[PDB]
Amino acid sequence: RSLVEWLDRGWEALAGGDRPDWLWSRRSISVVLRHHYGTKQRFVVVSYENSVAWGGRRARPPRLSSELATALTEACAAERVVRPHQLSPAAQTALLRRFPALEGPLRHPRPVLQPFDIAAEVAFVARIQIACLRALGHSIRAALQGGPRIFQRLRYDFGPHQSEWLGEVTRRFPVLLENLMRALEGTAPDAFFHTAYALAVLAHLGGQLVPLSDDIPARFADSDAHYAFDYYSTSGDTLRLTNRPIAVVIDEQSKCRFMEGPHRVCEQYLPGESYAYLCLGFNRRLCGLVVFPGGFAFTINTAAYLSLADPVARAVGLRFCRGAA
Amino acid sequence: MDPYYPFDALDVWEHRRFIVADSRSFITPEFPRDFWMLPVFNIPRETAA
Amino acid sequence: WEHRRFIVADSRSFITPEFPRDFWMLPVFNIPRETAA
Amino acid sequence: IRDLNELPDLNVLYYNGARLSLVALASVNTELRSLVLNMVYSITEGTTLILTLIPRLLALGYVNALLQMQSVTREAAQLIHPEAPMLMRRLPLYEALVAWLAHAGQLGDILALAPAVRVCTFDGAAVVQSGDMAPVIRYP
Amino acid sequence: MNAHFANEVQYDLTRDPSSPASLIHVIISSECLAAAGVPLSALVRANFRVETQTRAHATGDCTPWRSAFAAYVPADAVGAILAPVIPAHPDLLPRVPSAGGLFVSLPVACDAQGVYDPYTVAALRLAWGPWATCARVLLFSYDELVPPNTRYAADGARLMRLCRHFCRYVARLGAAAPAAATEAAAHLSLGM
């Protein structure tokens, strides 16, 4: 009977149960302090004594080695170089001979990610942000280029006094079109992927699966009539008033209806039904619709100006979507 | 700045239960538009550049 | 019953926009392939 | 069995909103030591005869195939997990089955605990408390 | 605590083995989550579901998302590990309060002669609800996650406090203590 068995019988006296969670707590516990490159904050890596996972005294070979990592530091450290691509290709092939996996980052002509970097993954995101924006402005410029007559694709009745309001929509019309693409550009690349437009892209490229978070309604893949929408404040600061992209089906004028299901007051209204909402929408076909108050709205096809590499498109989806059930 | 319309206005009677060929209307706020301000986007103090 | 004025909703009705002259040339609508941001 | 090397639970029972405590001890453990020496042995004899016969025969056509359909990562995985910390002259396999079915068949008789009392209360409480008398029949 | 136990049972399927892997138990802090765009109050409302996938260094496809287990503690996480508390007796182990967060063990992509590629990325996901606004994704590098060396050294002195705390706690409880406990106190004091 070691001292440990008495400790193991110390609890079983005051416990009334083994409680395996405690049994490892009575053993050795390895606490390694770490830091998070993203938040600069701390997260504690732990490996128990009997833990089968890494750091545990019971573990299966082979274990993790620094062989790839340690060399990569001194490869350009002995060269006093910041980057392995500024390393001479003689030493670059030197580690390749030992390490056949380094071909991918080193020998790939057009790596979808900047090899041997940290923020390279972020650069992957931000360029897609830009890629989506120009797919609008060029397409926005397209339909609006020569001064058009939009008429209205929706159906609303106007009072005699409401006409004076619509007169204000004229003057107020161009300033908003700036402010949209202003904020749309200004959005954080992360949060942008929750917007109704980024979902249409993740839906459209998937059409060429289920985009993650199930934001897409099940019938959004039925007809090109099923849409998604966001709203924007008409007066004062122009902002995005809708967390959840709103799904509406349309059917010249045709009526509209919501779909099946905390509260967003913006959801009791149809697009362009009331003042102080700029109503923006897209499709599975990714034919855009821009709906201003009063129901006056025009189509935009942004699929034409959207340009992306398939190896990028398929790589983006697998991160942002899921294999369909 | 008045938007174009073919018609001026009409006077029609509509019973509640007998409504057929349904339609919808448009909403304007209750305060005078002098309190409905022009749209503004503040360009941030600096650019990522 | 109920009474209100009436205006037919028509695709023949439209609200005429008018853009500024430099409106089409902007850092927004015109973006390079890679920006500084 | 745990005293032959417990949990903080397993000593507390719930019936009809009432809590019990089986701890409420070492005299009781020696009072019950012979059952532990039979409940352990009837299992360790049992699981080995399952383990030393199915790879020994797997007698084939549809008998072993329906057995393997039941052993599709269920019994054979439990076999390969136990035979990892195990092994695979004349072993008295067929003679030990009679010795096992007699012994393990006996413990089912002892731990059966047959009901004699069937309570049909009439003009009384549907739940009879502790210390009270209950109307009892053993007849239809 | 239990989130690491339950996950190792999953890592016991050796996965495939054809592609060798490893597992690293990680305790995220709350302030690391707060800066990550994580509302803390939403988690509090006992495991929690998390999707993970591994992402290649330069070119390739990401692993398909797979559900892992997470348990969030709005208290000292390292303290719960270090000084477990008997539900009946809290005063048995005094300890210093700290902050904490969810527990998730993370997969590590190994090789034959397992060596991790640094700058390769492992990813979490946190769903507060169906919609993506309730979903966040955090990234980590095998450099970030894998420390070069562990420490079991500092934990040694800790255990002797327990042998002292038990021997100290029983001495206070005195006659009320169950006999088996007073017994162990004798030997454990002899080990002191």
XYZ file of C-alpha atoms in Angstrom:
743
model
C 0.000 0.000 0.000
C 1.700 3.162 -1.180
C 0.749 6.591 0.092
C -1.251 7.059 -3.102
C -3.637 4.200 -2.316
C -4.375 5.894 0.997
C -5.091 9.123 -0.864
C -7.200 7.069 -3.260
C -8.837 5.743 -0.101
C -8.865 9.245 1.364
C -11.495 10.414 -1.086
C -13.379 7.103 -1.103
C -13.797 7.755 2.620
C -15.039 11.333 2.212
C -16.536 10.833 -1.255
C -18.639 7.683 -1.381
C -17.569 7.150 -4.965
C -14.463 6.687 -7.048
C -15.268 9.641 -9.350
C -12.665 8.950 -12.069
C -12.421 12.694 -12.784
C -10.730 13.051 -9.408
C -8.416 10.071 -9.845
C -6.299 11.853 -12.438
C -6.378 14.988 -10.289
C -4.598 13.001 -7.573
C -1.934 12.077 -10.138
C 0.583 14.281 -11.932
C -0.842 17.059 -14.115
C 1.223 18.804 -16.796
C 0.231 22.452 -17.253
C 1.918 24.260 -20.152
C 1.106 27.947 -20.567
C 0.669 29.094 -24.160
C -0.356 32.222 -26.035
C -2.808 32.730 -28.868
C -1.389 34.474 -31.928
C -4.821 35.834 -32.831
C -5.908 37.386 -29.528
C -2.442 37.594 -27.898
C -4.249 36.027 -24.936
C -3.493 32.786 -23.144
C -4.786 29.247 -23.468
C -3.490 26.437 -21.293
C -2.424 23.166 -22.906
C -2.789 20.289 -20.442
C -1.717 16.661 -20.598
C -2.646 14.410 -17.712
C -0.386 11.700 -16.319
C -2.425 8.720 -17.579
C -3.749 10.679 -20.578
C -3.411 8.825 -23.873
C -3.282 12.108 -25.802
C -0.100 14.094 -26.408
C 2.053 14.807 -23.374
C 0.578 11.905 -21.434
C 2.924 9.370 -19.890
C 0.921 6.680 -21.713
C 1.063 7.475 -25.422
C 1.359 5.602 -28.697
C 4.423 5.949 -30.963
C 5.273 7.665 -33.166
C 5.031 10.935 -31.269
C 5.212 14.524 -32.477
C 8.647 15.717 -33.590
C 9.989 19.189 -34.399
C 12.033 17.859 -37.320
C 10.072 19.868 -39.890
C 9.778 22.906 -37.619
C 13.261 23.200 -36.092
C 15.005 23.068 -39.470
C 12.708 25.700 -40.998
C 13.794 28.191 -38.341
C 17.549 27.785 -38.750
C 17.307 27.356 -42.526
C 16.847 31.109 -42.976
C 18.190 31.926 -39.512
C 21.674 30.719 -40.437
C 21.004 32.724 -43.606
C 19.649 35.676 -41.569
C 16.704 35.663 -43.986
C 13.109 36.441 -43.060
C 11.450 34.105 -45.587
C 12.219 30.645 -47.045
C 11.490 31.908 -50.560
C 14.299 34.408 -50.103
C 16.360 31.392 -49.051
C 18.627 30.100 -51.792
C 17.068 27.180 -53.709
C 20.098 25.046 -52.851
C 19.212 25.113 -49.153
C 15.527 25.034 -50.101
C 16.061 21.678 -51.808
C 18.260 20.640 -48.870
C 15.294 20.265 -46.528
C 13.166 18.939 -49.397
C 15.472 15.922 -49.620
C 14.821 15.102 -45.969
C 11.210 16.308 -45.998
C 9.173 15.346 -49.092
C 6.050 17.128 -47.815
C 7.608 20.609 -48.178
C 7.187 20.341 -51.963
C 3.621 21.607 -51.678
C 4.397 24.979 -50.090
C 7.743 25.433 -51.889
C 7.274 23.878 -55.339
C 3.693 24.874 -56.037
C 3.548 27.582 -58.725
C 0.295 29.264 -57.622
C -0.311 28.295 -53.994
C -3.854 29.133 -52.946
C -2.262 30.176 -49.645
C 0.959 32.119 -49.236
C 3.348 29.377 -48.092
C 5.274 29.527 -44.801
C 3.383 32.554 -43.484
C 0.958 33.267 -40.656
C -1.556 35.875 -41.864
C -1.444 34.186 -45.290
C -4.772 32.575 -44.399
C -6.236 36.023 -43.734
C -4.969 37.236 -47.111
C -6.932 34.321 -48.549
C -10.075 35.788 -46.997
C -9.584 39.500 -47.678
C -8.889 38.996 -51.380
C -12.185 37.129 -51.662
C -13.811 40.121 -49.980
C -12.410 42.361 -52.715
C -13.295 39.775 -55.363
C -16.942 39.944 -54.285
C -17.068 43.748 -54.125
C -15.862 44.395 -57.669
C -18.383 41.769 -58.769
C -20.920 44.348 -57.585
C -19.582 47.771 -58.551
C -18.885 46.637 -62.095
C -22.303 44.954 -62.219
C -23.904 47.875 -60.384
C -22.363 50.235 -62.929
C -23.655 47.941 -65.674
C -27.430 48.250 -65.289
C -27.290 51.851 -64.025
C -24.824 53.134 -66.593
C -26.942 55.058 -69.043
C -29.705 56.784 -67.148
C -32.445 54.189 -66.942
C -36.137 53.939 -66.145
C -36.425 51.352 -63.381
C -40.220 51.563 -62.999
C -41.165 49.140 -60.208
C -41.156 45.372 -59.974
C -43.373 45.502 -56.867
C -46.941 46.548 -56.054
C -47.857 49.337 -53.615
C -50.495 52.042 -53.331
C -49.540 55.653 -52.663
C -51.453 58.405 -50.937
C -51.508 61.992 -52.169
C -49.316 63.059 -49.260
C -46.921 60.151 -49.742
C -45.928 61.584 -53.126
C -44.076 64.404 -51.365
C -42.030 61.733 -49.597
C -41.165 60.007 -52.862
C -39.887 63.344 -54.134
C -37.296 63.141 -51.391
C -36.321 59.639 -52.524
C -35.162 61.118 -55.837
C -32.625 63.481 -54.293
C -31.690 60.892 -51.669
C -31.259 58.160 -54.290
C -27.574 58.409 -55.344
C -26.120 58.994 -51.872
C -27.327 55.584 -50.692
C -25.797 53.699 -53.621
C -22.444 55.027 -52.469
C -23.084 54.201 -48.812
C -23.991 50.576 -49.550
C -20.738 49.757 -51.310
C -19.059 52.017 -48.754
C -20.131 49.822 -45.846
C -20.082 46.625 -47.922
C -16.410 47.368 -48.462
C -16.036 48.569 -44.876
C -17.440 45.407 -43.298
C -15.026 43.115 -41.533
C -14.146 40.183 -43.818
C -15.214 37.686 -41.152
C -18.659 39.154 -40.415
C -19.181 39.854 -44.122
C -19.615 36.106 -44.656
C -22.796 36.245 -42.576
C -24.384 38.797 -44.925
C -27.080 37.917 -47.448
C -24.729 38.510 -50.380
C -21.878 36.298 -49.175
C -24.462 33.568 -48.639
C -25.628 33.852 -52.254
C -22.025 33.312 -53.365
C -21.509 30.346 -51.044
C -24.847 29.160 -52.404
C -23.948 29.843 -56.047
C -20.522 28.188 -56.003
C -22.096 25.260 -54.164
C -24.558 25.000 -57.038
C -21.727 24.602 -59.541
C -24.075 21.295 -50.671
C -25.371 23.021 -47.526
C -23.631 26.280 -46.581
C -22.837 26.286 -42.896
C -25.221 27.561 -40.187
C -28.165 26.442 -42.381
C -28.899 30.071 -43.210
C -30.335 28.913 -46.549
C -34.009 27.906 -46.470
C -34.635 24.397 -47.748
C -36.707 25.683 -50.699
C -34.064 28.232 -51.708
C -32.822 25.531 -54.111
C -36.279 25.062 -55.665
C -36.952 28.008 -57.959
C -34.997 31.090 -58.966
C -37.811 33.011 -57.252
C -36.568 32.131 -53.747
C -34.409 35.009 -52.543
C -32.417 36.400 -49.619
C -32.364 39.979 -48.347
C -30.757 42.570 -46.101
C -32.038 45.999 -45.076
C -30.302 49.354 -44.675
C -31.237 52.552 -42.884
C -32.299 55.284 -45.277
C -31.751 58.261 -42.968
C -28.770 59.210 -40.870
C -26.024 56.621 -40.689
C -26.517 53.871 -43.256
C -26.227 50.567 -41.408
C -27.261 46.926 -41.657
C -30.475 46.570 -39.685
C -30.760 42.817 -40.153
C -28.670 40.135 -38.509
C -30.541 37.252 -40.193
C -30.864 37.458 -43.989
C -34.573 37.533 -44.817
C -35.961 35.067 -47.366
C -38.771 36.240 -49.656
C -40.190 34.746 -52.849
C -41.384 36.908 -55.731
C -43.366 35.840 -58.806
C -43.957 43.256 -64.303
C -45.648 43.409 -60.902
C -46.242 40.304 -58.813
C -47.035 39.927 -55.144
C -44.635 38.563 -52.542
C -44.757 36.280 -49.524
C -42.412 35.233 -46.736
C -41.307 31.667 -46.046
C -41.634 29.363 -43.051
C -39.750 30.210 -39.871
C -35.486 36.578 -31.344
C -37.681 39.230 -32.977
C -36.534 41.663 -35.639
C -39.100 44.374 -36.325
C -37.661 44.547 -39.860
C -39.224 41.117 -40.511
C -42.878 42.196 -40.326
C -42.374 44.176 -43.553
C -41.957 43.170 -47.175
C -38.956 44.547 -49.084
C -39.408 48.147 -50.160
C -42.744 48.260 -48.369
C -41.938 51.169 -46.060
C -39.660 54.156 -45.722
C -36.241 53.874 -44.083
C -35.407 50.483 -45.558
C -33.110 49.893 -48.492
C -34.002 46.402 -49.642
C -31.190 44.407 -51.257
C -31.545 40.836 -52.513
C -30.089 37.979 -54.542
C -30.942 34.548 -55.905
C -29.576 31.045 -56.212
C -29.051 32.060 -59.840
C -27.363 35.068 -58.201
C -29.429 37.598 -60.128
C -29.426 40.573 -57.782
C -32.374 42.795 -56.962
C -32.142 46.272 -55.435
C -35.440 47.440 -53.937
C -35.893 51.036 -52.833
C -38.818 52.305 -50.735
C -41.940 52.624 -52.843
C -41.334 49.321 -54.611
C -39.181 50.747 -57.398
C -36.605 48.068 -58.096
C -34.394 46.784 -60.892
C -32.541 43.565 -61.633
C -28.788 43.080 -61.574
C -26.976 39.981 -62.806
C -23.659 39.920 -60.964
C -22.737 36.398 -62.079
C -21.172 37.856 -65.233
C -18.700 40.073 -63.365
C -18.017 37.477 -60.647
C -14.630 35.901 -61.402
C -13.031 33.256 -59.170
C -10.753 30.258 -59.545
C -12.436 26.867 -59.175
C -9.589 25.581 -56.949
C -10.308 28.630 -54.801
C -14.087 28.214 -55.035
C -13.961 24.562 -53.997
C -11.529 25.436 -51.192
C -13.711 28.277 -49.909
C -16.848 26.138 -49.831
C -15.392 23.232 -47.861
C -14.560 25.769 -45.161
C -17.809 27.772 -45.276
C -20.269 25.031 -46.287
C -20.944 21.423 -45.338
C -21.536 18.277 -47.337
C -25.308 18.073 -47.637
C -27.167 15.593 -45.435
C -38.876 65.265 -58.151
C -42.356 63.806 -58.298
C -42.309 60.185 -59.514
C -44.202 59.485 -62.721
C -47.725 58.016 -62.569
C -50.390 57.286 -65.204
C -53.305 57.978 -62.839
C -54.166 60.754 -60.383
C -56.427 59.081 -57.802
C -59.798 57.361 -57.420
C -62.590 56.878 -54.875
C -63.612 53.254 -54.238
C -65.694 51.540 -51.546
C -64.393 48.258 -50.099
C -66.221 45.905 -47.736
C -64.172 43.966 -45.194
C -65.333 40.367 -45.692
C -65.790 40.670 -49.464
C -62.271 41.858 -50.335
C -61.279 40.128 -53.576
C -58.074 40.637 -55.579
C -56.018 41.707 -52.557
C -53.257 44.357 -52.590
C -50.906 46.281 -50.292
C -49.897 49.862 -49.520
C -46.916 52.047 -48.612
C -45.856 53.499 -45.247
C -44.546 56.977 -44.425
C -43.531 58.036 -40.901
C -45.605 60.216 -38.594
C -43.074 62.947 -37.999
C -42.450 65.738 -40.527
C -39.708 64.879 -42.984
C -37.675 67.797 -41.639
C -36.883 65.325 -38.864
C -36.052 62.670 -41.463
C -32.428 63.471 -42.131
C -30.316 63.075 -45.239
C -28.237 59.873 -45.341
C -24.699 60.174 -43.975
C -21.785 57.755 -43.908
C -18.800 58.900 -41.901
C -15.596 57.995 -43.691
C -13.268 56.659 -40.968
C -10.608 59.025 -39.691
C -7.831 57.059 -41.399
C -7.529 54.536 -44.212
C -5.825 51.159 -43.944
C -3.353 52.796 -46.325
C -66.831 49.679 -44.582
C -63.710 51.824 -44.985
C -62.658 54.736 -47.199
C -59.274 55.954 -48.433
C -57.826 57.443 -51.567
C -56.523 55.107 -54.240
C -53.676 54.988 -56.766
C -53.178 51.914 -58.954
C -49.838 50.153 -58.505
C -48.398 50.163 -62.009
C -45.154 49.113 -63.655
C -45.646 52.199 -65.859
C -44.915 54.483 -62.873
C -41.339 55.439 -62.091
C -39.171 57.709 -59.971
C -36.439 59.320 -62.060
C -32.928 59.166 -60.543
C -30.277 61.750 -61.428
C -26.636 61.048 -60.728
C -23.741 63.431 -60.181
C -21.315 63.775 -63.060
C -18.274 62.355 -61.231
C -20.605 59.834 -59.567
C -19.448 57.042 -61.863
C -15.759 57.601 -61.112
C -15.166 56.736 -57.490
C -12.653 54.707 -55.461
C -15.684 52.560 -54.648
C -17.026 51.521 -58.059
C -13.444 51.435 -59.388
C -11.312 49.013 -57.388
C -7.901 47.612 -58.386
C -7.172 43.914 -58.378
C -5.410 44.273 -55.008
C -5.966 47.227 -52.680
C -3.925 48.553 -49.770
C -6.527 47.547 -47.179
C -16.138 -6.628 -6.029
C -14.507 -3.212 -5.566
C -13.141 -4.381 -2.199
C -11.126 -7.103 -3.960
C -8.545 -4.937 -5.771
C -16.326 2.339 -5.805
C -18.343 5.297 -7.084
C -19.842 8.272 -5.192
C -23.180 7.136 -6.596
C -24.486 3.482 -6.549
C -25.140 3.741 -2.785
C -28.323 5.805 -3.203
C -31.606 4.371 -4.445
C -34.812 6.146 -5.454
C -38.256 4.582 -5.274
C -41.553 6.504 -5.349
C -39.963 9.797 -4.339
C -38.105 8.205 -1.415
C -34.333 8.119 -0.999
C -32.384 5.172 0.400
C -28.755 4.737 1.436
C -27.214 1.287 1.236
C -24.217 2.542 3.214
C -26.371 4.130 5.981
C -20.167 -1.913 6.863
C -17.182 -4.269 6.796
C -19.213 -6.891 8.655
C -21.744 -6.724 5.815
C -18.932 -7.107 3.289
C -17.760 -10.339 4.920
C -21.430 -11.330 5.181
C -21.612 -11.171 1.387
C -18.129 -12.373 0.425
C -19.236 -15.820 -0.761
C -21.619 -14.370 -3.359
C -18.785 -12.219 -4.696
C -16.650 -15.341 -5.039
C -19.452 -16.972 -7.041
C -20.557 -14.009 -9.151
C -16.985 -13.382 -10.263
C -16.207 -17.012 -11.082
C -19.429 -17.678 -12.988
C -18.571 -14.772 -15.309
C -14.863 -15.530 -15.727
C -15.673 -19.152 -16.476
C -18.437 -17.961 -18.784
C -16.651 -15.396 -20.960
C -13.725 -17.738 -21.584
C -15.951 -20.558 -22.845
C -17.510 -18.051 -25.228
C -14.031 -16.925 -26.237
C -12.465 -20.402 -26.558
C -15.226 -21.923 -28.666
C -16.235 -19.430 -31.350
C -12.739 -19.204 -32.909
C -12.320 -22.892 -32.099
C -15.276 -24.048 -34.202
C -17.265 -21.275 -35.951
C -19.036 -24.379 -37.327
C -20.087 -23.824 -40.969
C -23.271 -22.911 -42.709
C -25.972 -20.476 -41.647
C -25.234 -21.175 -37.970
C -21.838 -19.457 -37.934
C -22.993 -16.943 -40.555
C -25.869 -15.733 -38.385
C -23.376 -15.847 -35.512
C -20.912 -13.737 -37.509
C -23.779 -11.406 -38.449
C -24.192 -11.021 -34.702
C -20.387 -10.957 -34.368
C -19.964 -8.219 -36.985
C -17.779 -5.906 -34.838
C -19.984 -6.761 -31.824
C -18.836 -10.155 -30.561
C -15.656 -10.556 -32.617
C -14.596 -7.024 -31.673
C -15.274 -7.968 -28.061
C -13.334 -11.154 -28.811
C -10.362 -9.308 -30.328
C -10.393 -6.781 -27.478
C -10.322 -9.563 -24.847
C -7.999 -11.899 -26.768
C -5.481 -9.062 -27.076
C -4.838 -9.333 -23.294
C -5.144 -13.126 -23.542
C -4.091 -16.175 -25.520
C -6.124 -18.051 -28.131
C -2.455 -30.778 -24.939
C -6.209 -31.295 -24.590
C -8.355 -28.492 -23.233
C -11.530 -29.878 -21.574
C -13.839 -27.473 -23.375
C -16.937 -29.669 -23.708
C -16.586 -30.957 -20.141
C -16.448 -27.438 -18.698
C -19.760 -26.422 -20.286
C -21.607 -28.931 -18.107
C -19.623 -27.668 -15.127
C -20.510 -24.099 -16.088
C -24.209 -24.528 -16.884
C -24.670 -26.338 -13.587
C -22.952 -23.586 -11.618
C -24.172 -20.508 -13.489
C -27.627 -22.031 -13.775
C -27.668 -22.369 -9.991
C -27.030 -18.677 -9.287
C -30.042 -17.690 -11.373
C -32.189 -19.731 -8.997
C -30.701 -18.070 -5.918
C -30.875 -14.488 -7.202
C -34.353 -14.969 -8.671
C -36.288 -13.572 -5.656
C -39.762 -14.699 -6.612
C -42.805 -12.611 -5.623
C -45.283 -14.132 -3.203
C -47.110 -10.992 -2.084
C -49.377 -9.240 -4.559
C -51.057 -6.208 -3.026
C -54.625 -5.488 -4.090
C -55.777 -2.689 -1.805
C -59.495 -2.009 -1.706
C -61.110 0.929 0.125
C -57.648 2.032 1.129
C -54.594 3.995 0.127
C -53.030 3.105 -3.197
C -49.632 3.718 -1.573
C -49.028 2.080 1.806
C -46.415 3.810 3.938
C -43.586 2.344 5.985
C -44.681 0.725 9.228
C -48.271 0.331 8.044
C -50.208 -2.848 7.292
C -51.107 -3.742 3.725
C -53.843 -6.042 2.409
C -52.095 -8.922 0.681
C -53.318 -11.701 -1.596
C -51.617 -14.576 -3.327
C -54.655 -15.900 -5.266
C -56.727 -14.581 -8.184
C -12.648 18.064 -16.844
C -14.862 15.443 -18.410
C -14.601 16.985 -21.878
C -11.067 15.621 -22.200
C -12.106 12.173 -20.992
C -14.969 11.856 -23.470
C -12.798 12.961 -26.384
C -10.011 10.470 -25.697
C -12.643 7.735 -25.941
C -13.228 9.091 -29.438
C -9.497 9.231 -30.164
C -9.410 5.569 -29.137
C -10.786 4.742 -32.580
C -7.208 5.541 -33.717
C -8.415 7.503 -36.703
C -8.040 6.002 -39.229
C -5.282 4.655 -38.224
C -4.274 4.885 -41.923
C -3.741 8.601 -41.426
C -1.875 8.799 -38.101
C -3.013 11.511 -35.704
C -2.639 12.818 -32.150
C -4.666 14.727 -29.592
C -3.896 17.736 -27.390
C -6.087 18.744 -24.463
C -6.540 22.510 -24.511
C -8.078 24.913 -22.013
C -9.118 28.148 -23.679
C -9.444 31.130 -21.404
C -12.504 33.351 -21.294
C -10.626 36.536 -22.171
C -9.183 34.725 -25.181
C -12.749 33.911 -26.214
C -14.001 37.408 -25.396
C -11.405 38.918 -27.730
C -12.412 36.240 -30.246
C -15.865 37.773 -30.721
C -17.472 35.353 -28.276
C -20.291 36.524 -25.997
C -19.581 34.823 -22.688
C -23.108 34.929 -21.278
C -24.563 32.921 -24.157
C -22.502 29.809 -23.416
C -23.520 29.769 -19.749
C -27.167 29.080 -20.611
C -23.248 19.854 -19.270
C -21.257 19.454 -22.468
C -21.329 21.737 -25.504
C -20.966 20.943 -29.198
C -18.073 22.191 -31.339
C -17.168 21.511 -34.970
C -13.502 21.177 -35.936
C -11.546 20.758 -39.150
C -7.866 20.782 -40.078
C -6.590 22.973 -42.902
C -3.541 22.268 -45.038
C -0.396 24.395 -44.918
C -0.271 25.812 -48.443
C -2.569 24.051 -50.906
C -5.195 21.383 -50.462
C -8.663 20.889 -49.030
C -9.690 21.263 -45.423
C -10.832 18.292 -43.421
C -14.635 18.068 -43.357
C -16.011 19.534 -40.153
C -16.379 17.015 -37.327
C -18.187 17.435 -34.019
C -16.128 17.438 -30.825
C -17.032 17.879 -27.165
C -16.674 21.038 -25.117
C -17.456 21.920 -21.521
C -17.282 25.550 -20.429
C -16.454 26.503 -16.848
C -17.093 30.128 -15.818
C -14.609 29.725 -12.963
C -10.972 28.793 -12.468
C -10.371 26.018 -14.964
C -6.849 25.130 -13.880
C -8.047 25.217 -10.272
C -10.788 22.664 -10.895
C -8.112 20.367 -12.319
C -5.674 21.030 -9.496
C -7.898 21.080 -6.396
C -11.036 19.004 -6.952
C -13.698 19.722 -4.402
C -15.724 17.129 -2.605
C -19.328 18.092 -3.209
C -20.064 17.615 0.475
C -16.952 19.337 1.837
C -15.868 22.519 0.025
C -13.361 23.619 2.690
C -11.222 20.504 2.213
C -8.998 22.193 -0.386
C -8.421 25.954 -0.266
C -7.159 27.408 -3.538
C -6.597 30.666 -5.405
C -9.466 31.739 -7.684
C -8.779 32.257 -11.377
C -10.561 32.506 -14.703
C -11.292 29.741 -17.170
C -13.128 28.581 -20.271
C -14.184 25.616 -22.334
C -12.159 22.410 -22.529
C -11.483 20.955 -25.973
C -8.858 18.444 -26.995
C -7.716 19.054 -30.539
C -6.619 16.649 -33.285
C -3.084 16.789 -34.636
C -2.212 15.546 -38.112
C 0.703 13.119 -37.886
C 2.818 11.249 -40.421
C 4.652 7.986 -40.610
C 7.415 8.993 -38.254
C 4.971 11.580 -37.044
C 6.175 15.143 -37.516
C 3.841 18.117 -37.619
C 4.115 20.764 -40.289
C 4.170 24.106 -38.446
C 1.972 26.874 -39.840
C -0.624 24.207 -40.686
C -3.952 25.170 -39.171
C -6.523 23.499 -36.923
C -9.907 25.189 -36.588
C -12.829 25.336 -34.170
C -16.398 26.523 -34.587
C -18.780 27.812 -31.906
C -22.534 27.794 -32.545
C -24.757 29.818 -30.231
C -27.681 29.119 -32.530
C -28.630 28.176 -36.074
C -27.672 31.362 -37.889
C -24.100 32.223 -38.806
C -24.046 35.319 -36.590
C -24.202 32.759 -33.755
C -21.251 30.953 -35.345
C -17.593 31.884 -34.949
C -14.446 30.142 -36.176
C -11.080 30.214 -34.408
C -7.760 29.161 -35.913
C -4.587 27.673 -34.439
C -1.225 26.593 -35.781
C 0.554 23.377 -34.884
C 3.338 25.746 -33.843
C 0.891 27.628 -31.610
C -0.657 24.491 -30.131
C 2.314 22.145 -29.686
C 4.768 23.307 -27.016
C 8.268 21.842 -27.348
C 8.507 20.431 -23.816
C 6.090 19.647 -21.012
C 6.375 20.163 -17.272
C 5.497 17.552 -14.699
C 8.054 19.121 -12.360
C 6.026 21.935 -10.783
C 3.105 19.603 -10.058
C 5.115 17.475 -7.623
C 5.022 19.755 -4.577
C 1.249 20.151 -5.082
C 0.511 16.562 -4.083
C 2.259 16.903 -0.725
C -0.112 19.753 0.097
C -2.976 17.315 -0.421
C -1.401 14.841 2.005
C -1.132 17.889 4.257
C -4.614 19.224 3.491
C -6.269 15.853 4.113
C -4.252 15.404 7.304
C -5.116 19.008 8.149
C -8.803 18.835 7.236
C -9.410 15.633 9.194
C -7.720 17.059 12.292
C -10.299 19.855 12.269
C -13.207 17.496 11.631
C -11.939 15.270 14.445
C -14.528 12.916 15.929
C -17.026 13.595 13.123
C -14.599 12.199 10.544
C -15.309 8.684 9.254
C -12.861 6.190 10.707
C -11.407 5.176 7.332
C -10.409 8.805 6.779
C -8.686 9.141 10.161
C -6.858 5.904 9.356
C -5.403 7.150 6.068
C -4.387 10.319 7.904
C -2.026 8.221 10.038
C -0.085 6.725 7.131
C -0.277 9.892 5.038
C 1.117 11.855 7.976
C 3.916 9.291 8.161
C 4.581 10.066 4.515
C 4.798 13.747 5.424
